[PDB]
């Protein structure tokens, strides 16, 4: 759906697609690693991988540390580069001057 | 916090031992008994402590080889749950109090003639104990011996009495047997003369370029076993129809028997057996299993005599079991005397009667009738808890004694340490009942063995492992045709049968506390820490009402992969609990699928469900002894399966029973192997590449290994039987930890060597079983070394793969790149630290791994380093600077344990070594050669010798 | 895949083809730079083309050169370190009988 323009200009559709893409990327890393490692050359060395609760707890924990650092960044430092934005404004003014 | 390391004190002796050099291990010759029969073992004492057990090359029945129980006796001695004190009634007591009570009780018996006094031992073969028991019987005429053990040979002596009219001992010399037929005889399993039979059979199966003959094995069994694996033809007949099968076999050869209505497959099998027999007269042998009824033994003796095998492959000796008797009948007589209240004192010497006796005898209830019960158990067993005056028994590795092997040899049980917790032996008790208390076990066996072989004979006997004077004489009994001909010969029927078989790793349940044996994956089943009802897939489908066709497993080569996928889907029914009703008993044991099993037959493994065992195995498995009956102790009549749902978690070390059309296991025929030993390798490569040679090309140079030693190993598939002796030897030698059942369920078992069965062929309900040992292949271009970032896994000058524990950070990448998956990781803290006895069992030449490191097979590097150092020291002390290692100087633990000799280790570069000659054969190949790993551990393809009448 | 890789049906590479696109991109960029130097005075470039497009195309040539080297080294190290025999004959022939000097 990203091929079209109306979908590309819709905000809720972009949020849903981004969430689905992130889930698919985690699934792709899982398919590459776990599935390939489960069944190797010797059939006798075959087993199944079932994740526990602690590696999940580490995952949510890493999300929290990531968001803690982001919230501290947006609270202390400016989240948009200021001098680059005013330079962009000056460049657009010069472009409008040259038509 | 500081100083890098603590103080580390050192405590030497106060008086040095005379013949010990500190830091040099020594070897002593002792004997280990399985079912009363001895086995000579060479046991290693590091600093006065037993640590390793190996074979005694000078002893028959152990020609440099051991069984799994002889290897695990090390940890059995170091169990922290062994009895430490005398218990009068669970109360800690003393030995002098028990002696005074025994003398006072025997004084009352002296008023009678010992009518109330009763004994209860196991299969006794020790001449000293037998002589002291006979002397005690002469002192007390009305006393009775009564020996019994759950795994006995009552059918063998009954068949010998029926045929010859006397007690005889039957020995088989398989080295001159071109055709061997087994009638439910698991002679390739741990039993009487197992190591000698397996060695002779293997040396007859080891084929080479110059080889010209090869023996053939016929087996007829209900549940598949190790013997059925090495069989060229296997017939899954029911357990009851084997007596009628033997009668039909005797009838076809022209000898007195009885025809039986059998299946067309069994008819064609009788045809081929009879045709290969009669053409190999004096070069054949028919073996009857101890489980089979006495008539089967007698018919086998008759068949062997008529064929002329007697004196060539079947030999008869005088009995070597002291008193040969029907043990179950004597147990019934003893429980009858107990129920009548006639017995007043019951002395038991091991055997655990409360747990081992059949359920219909009610031993525990009748045990209350006798007031005084006394037991020596080496543990606080179930019987000792319900008895008075429990006496701790000394372990065979800490006691003086003797024993007799099959064919009779009378070896000496030499101790290696004073008894840790005290504890007396059997002859010490027998001397106590003979009015001779505080008698030393040394002086007792030394007094009996003197005045018979002499002092110089006792010194020579202790030096070696055998006594040269004692051997069962060769006798020639006469055969009674009329008695063996006039026999009912029972027929099968009554429906679903139950087959009681000893557990491959636990035997009668004595070793249920041993962690090494409880964790050892069982052969053909790969289960650990549990017990299951083994049945064929068709039997489970028909009886438990499972939604599978069971006919889709039948097919040709065109749909083999689809059948293997269906077998994978069918294996999902493992764990369903079944309420087996046999004779008034419900067992409710989970089921397991064993393809080779005969239909309408369920195999239940003994030795589980103990309640007074140690911390290991205290509540594992479901007890099958209650449903076991005295009338038939090995076979069953009719049963009700009653599926209950309510699944139970069964744990397996493989979880995949089929090789998915790959070049893992190679099989050929002997007729084609004779013309060209390289024909198996020329195949596959044609179907994979179109040419007869795979022109593998590599981009890595590797190393040279020309003028230096190159350590290599060869595994002969024609000799491997899956006895799992190499696994217990590797565990005992390399300090391998023992993880729980929970850690095995998550696939975290720690084992440097593993045996894989692959259940392949058509039908998949009558499949050929392929056992293959796998350890570290020691790849010259090892892919596990080019991935570890801390260089903890590198390569050696001699081509060995060095795995250094103190450098591993634990990235677990060294395992993902290993094509064979032979590397085990300490995900948690697995090695024991608190138990002192387990710390005493560790081998001091191998580091004990901590949490977070990797392990794998190291070719027993401690033995390679010792031989290299000894070779360098001998070279410099003579002034040669040669440094040359002999061929047989190094022997890995898995090489010494193997009773068949399937594992051969040695120098690759030395052309005259046994490995260099074996690797030069046409059928020598290495696993997963498409990956340019260049393994140093190779395999010799399996060659079969099938009959033309069955194949065509 | 069809024209060039099918010459040896025993060998295949997934990165191959993308290596061909980066190779064709570097060739057409150098070809464009040559033809731009040829027609630099066509009375159309002189009035509408400055040094900025020439600098950008030079930067693109530099980026595609290191891109091609990155793809080729990636394929080489993947096949080299993982010494699988189904992918080694390719780099064997290219390192044999003097072909190494070309590399
Ligand atoms: S290789 Fe191991 S499993 Fe096979 S026969 Fe020898 S000791 Fe037994
Ligand atoms: S078998 Fe595995 S651990 Fe052993 S050398 Fe080869 S890759 Fe390494
Ligand atoms: S060679 Fe040694 S370490 Fe390797 S499997 Fe055999 S006993 Fe274990
Ligand atoms: S990757 Fe190396 S760090 Fe250890 S886990 Fe393997 S030897």
From TrEMBL, chain A:
The chain crosses the membrane at residues 11-36, 56-77. It comes from the Bacteria. It is found in: Cell membrane. Belongs to the NrfD family. This is Polysulphide reductase NrfD. It comes from Chloroflexus aurantiacus (strain ATCC 29366 / DSM 635 / J-10-fl). The chain holds residues 366 to 464 of 486 of the full protein.
From TrEMBL, chain B:
SUPFAM superfamilies: 4Fe-4S ferredoxins, Formate dehydrogenase/DMSO reductase, domains 1-3. [4Fe-4S] cluster 3 binds at residues 776, 779, 784, 818. Mg(2+) binds at residue 8. The keyword Metal-binding applies. [4Fe-4S] cluster 1 binds at residues 720, 723, 726, 898. It comes from Chloroflexus aurantiacus (strain ATCC 29366 / DSM 635 / J-10-fl). Residues 711-741 form the 4Fe-4S ferredoxin-type domain. PANTHER family: GLUTAMATE SYNTHASE [NADPH] SMALL CHAIN, GLUTAMATE SYNTHASE [NADPH] SMALL CHAIN-RELATED. [3Fe-4S] cluster binds at residues 788, 808-814. InterPro entries: 4Fe4S_Fe-S-bd, TAT_signal, TAT_var_transloc_signal_dom. PROSITE patterns: 4FE4S_FER_2 (PS51379), TAT (PS51318). The keyword Amino-acid biosynthesis does not apply. Keywords: 3Fe-4S, 4Fe-4S, Heme, Iron, Iron-sulfur, Metal-binding. [4Fe-4S] cluster 2 binds at residues 730, 857, 860, 894. Gene3D superfamilies: 3.30.70.20, 3.40.50.740, ADC-like domains, Dimethylsulfoxide Reductase, domain 2, Formate dehydrogenase/DMSO reductase. One of its GO terms (molecular function) is 3 iron, 4 sulfur cluster binding. Heme c binds at residues 868, 872. This is Fe-S-cluster-containing hydrogenase components 1-like protein.
UniProtKB/TrEMBL annotation, chain C:
The chain crosses the membrane at residues 17-36, 57-79. This is Quinol:cytochrome c oxidoreductase quinone-binding subunit 2. It comes from Chloroflexus aurantiacus (strain ATCC 29366 / DSM 635 / J-10-fl). The lineage of its organism: Bacteria, Bacillati, Chloroflexota, Chloroflexia, Chloroflexales. The chain holds residues 207 to 309 of 411 of the full protein.
């Amino acid at each position: 759906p990203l091929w079209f323009k109306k979908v590309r200009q819709n905000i809720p559709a972009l949020l849903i697609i981004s969430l689905i893409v992130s889930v698919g990327m985690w699934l792709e890393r899982y398919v590459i690693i776990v599935i390939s490692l489960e069944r190797d050359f010797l059939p006798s060395s075959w087993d199944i991988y079932i994740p526990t609760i602690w590696d999940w707890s580490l995952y949510i924990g890493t999300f929290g540390l990531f968001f803690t650092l982001l919230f501290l960044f947006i609270r202390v430092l400016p989240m948009i580069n200021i001098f680059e934005m005013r330079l962009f404004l000056y460049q657009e003014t010069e472009k409008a001057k040259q038509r | 916090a500081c100083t890098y390391q603590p103080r580390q004190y050192i405590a030497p002796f106060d008086r040095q031992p005379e013949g010990r050099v500190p830091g040099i291990p020594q070897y002593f010759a002792s004997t280990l008994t399985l079912g009363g029969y001895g086995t000579g073992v060479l046991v290693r004492s590091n600093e006065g402590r037993p640590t390793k057990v190996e074979g005694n090359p000078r002893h028959p029945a152990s020609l440099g080889g051991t069984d799994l129980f002889a290897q695990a006796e090390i940890l059995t001695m170091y169990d922290p749950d062994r009895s430490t004190t005398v218990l009068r009634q669970g109360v800690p007591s003393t030995w002098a109090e028990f002696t005074t009570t025994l003398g006072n009780a025997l004084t009352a018996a002296r008023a009678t003639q010992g009518a109330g006094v009763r004994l209860l031992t196991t299969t006794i073969t020790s001449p000293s104990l037998a002589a002291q028991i006979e002397q005690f019987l002469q002192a007390y005429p009305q006393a009775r011996w009564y020996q019994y053990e759950p795994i006995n040979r009552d059918n063998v002596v009954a068949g010998a009495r029926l045929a010859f009219g006397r007690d005889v001992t039957t020995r088989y010399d398989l080295s001159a047997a071109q055709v061997v037929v087994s009638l439910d005889a698991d002679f390739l399993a741990p039993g009487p003369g197992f190591v000698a039979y397996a060695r002779a059979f293997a040396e007859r199966r080891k084929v080479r370029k110059d080889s010209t003959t090869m023996n053939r094995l016929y087996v007829v069994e209900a549940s598949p076993s190790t013997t059925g694996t090495a069989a060229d033809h296997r017939l899954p007949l029911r357990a009851d129809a084997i007596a009628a099968f033997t009668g039909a076999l005797a009838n076809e050869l022209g000898v007195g028997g009885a025809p039986a209505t059998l299946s067309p497959k069994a008819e064609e099998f009788l045809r081929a057996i009879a045709r290969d027999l009669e053409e190999h007269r004096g070069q054949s042998v028919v073996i009857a299993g101890d489980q089979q009824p006495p008539i089967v033994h007698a018919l086998a003796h008759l068949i062997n005599a008529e064929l002329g095998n007697v004196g060539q492959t079947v030999f008869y000796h005088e009995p070597v079991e002291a008193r040969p008797t029907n043990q179950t009948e004597e147990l019934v007589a003893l429980v009858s005397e107990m129920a009548a209240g006639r017995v007043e004192t019951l002395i038991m010497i091991g055997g655990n009667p409360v747990y081992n006796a059949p359920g219909d005898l009610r031993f525990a209830d009748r045990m209350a009738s006798v007031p005084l019960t006394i037991h020596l158990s080496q543990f606080v067993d179930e019987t000792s808890a319900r008895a008075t005056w429990h006496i701790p028994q000394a372990h065979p590795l800490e006691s003086w004694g003797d024993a007799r092997a099959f064919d009779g040899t009378a070896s000496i049980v030499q101790p290696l340490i004073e008894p840790l917790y005290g504890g007396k032996t059997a002859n010490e008790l027998l001397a106590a009942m003979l009015g001779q208390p505080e008698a030393e076990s040394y002086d007792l066996v030394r007094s009996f063995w003197l005045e018979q072989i002499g002092e110089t004979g006792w010194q020579v006997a202790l030096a070696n492992g055998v006594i040269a004077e004692t051997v069962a004489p060769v006798i020639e009994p006469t055969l009674n045709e009329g008695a063996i001909r006039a026999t009912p010969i029972p027929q099968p029927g009554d429906g679903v049968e139950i087959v009681f078989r000893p557990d491959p790793s636990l035997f009668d349940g004595f070793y249920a506390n041993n962690g090494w044996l409880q964790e050892l994956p069982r052969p053909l089943t790969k289960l650990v820490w549990d017990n299951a009802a083994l049945m064929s897939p068709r039997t489970a489908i028909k009886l438990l009402g499972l939604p599978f066709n069971a006919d889709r497993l039948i097919g040709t080569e065109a749909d083999d992969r689809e059948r293997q996928q269906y077998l994978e889907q069918l294996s999902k029914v493992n764990g369903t609990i079944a309420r087996i009703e046999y004779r008034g008993g419900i067992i409710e044991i989970p089921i397991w699928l064993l393809p080779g099993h005969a239909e309408d037959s369920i195999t239940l493994n003994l030795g589980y469900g103990r309640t007074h065992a140690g911390r290991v195995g205290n509540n594992v498995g479901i007890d099958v002894y209650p449903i076991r009956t005295s009338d038939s102790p090995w076979f069953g009549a009719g049963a009700r399966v009653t599926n209950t749902g309510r699944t139970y978690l069964l744990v397996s070390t493989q979880d995949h029973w089929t090789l998915e059309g790959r070049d893992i296991y190679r099989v050929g025929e002997f007729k084609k192997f004779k013309e060209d030993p390289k024909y198996i390798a020329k195949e596959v490569y044609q179907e994979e590449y179109g040419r007869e040679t795979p022109n593998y090309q590599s981009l890595q140079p590797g190393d040279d290994y020309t003028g230096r030693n190159a350590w290599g190993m060869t595994i002969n598939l024609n000799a491997c039987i899956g006895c799992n002796a190499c696994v217990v030897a590797c565990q005992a030698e390399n300090n391998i930890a023992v993880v729980g059942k929970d850690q095995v369920s998550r696939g975290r078992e720690m084992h440097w060597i593993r045996i894989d069965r692959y259940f392949a062929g058509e039908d998949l309900d009558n499949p050929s079983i392929y056992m293959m040992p796998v350890n570290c292949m020691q790849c010259e271009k090892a892919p596990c070394e080019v991935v570890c970032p801390v260089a903890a896994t590198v390569h050696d000058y001699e081509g060995l793969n060095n795995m250094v524990y103190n450098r591993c950070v634990g990235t677990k990448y060294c395992s993902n790149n290993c094509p064979y998956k032979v590397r085990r990781f300490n995900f948690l803290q697995y090695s024991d630290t608190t138990t002192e006895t387990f710390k005493l069992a560790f081998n001091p030449d191998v580091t004990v791994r901590i949490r977070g490191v990797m392990e794998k097979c190291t070719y027993c590097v401690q033995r390679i380093s010792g031989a290299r150092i000894a070779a360098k020291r001998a070279a410099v002390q003579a002034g040669q600077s040669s440094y040359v290692i002999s061929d047989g100087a190094i022997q890995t633990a898995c090489e010494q344990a193997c009773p068949t000799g399937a594992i051969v280790f040695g120098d690759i570069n030395d052309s005259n070594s046994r490995v260099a000659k074996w690797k030069a054969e046409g059928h020598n190949y290495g696993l997963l050669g498409f990956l340019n790993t260049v393994p140093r551990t190779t395999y010799l393809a399996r060659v079969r010798n099938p009959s033309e009448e069955l194949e065509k | 895949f069809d024209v060039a890789m099918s010459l040896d049906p025993h060998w295949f590479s997934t990165i191959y083809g993308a290596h061909y696109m980066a190779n064709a991109g570097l060739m057409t960029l150098a070809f464009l730079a040559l033809m731009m130097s040829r027609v630099r005075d066509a009375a159309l470039f002189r009035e509408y083309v400055s040094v900025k497009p020439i600098h950008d195309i030079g930067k693109l040539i530099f980026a595609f050169t290191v891109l091609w080297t990155y793809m080729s080294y990636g394929q080489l190290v993947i096949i080299w370190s993982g010494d699988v025999a189904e992918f080694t004959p390719w780099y064997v022939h290219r390192t044999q009988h003097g072909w190494v000097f070309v590399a």
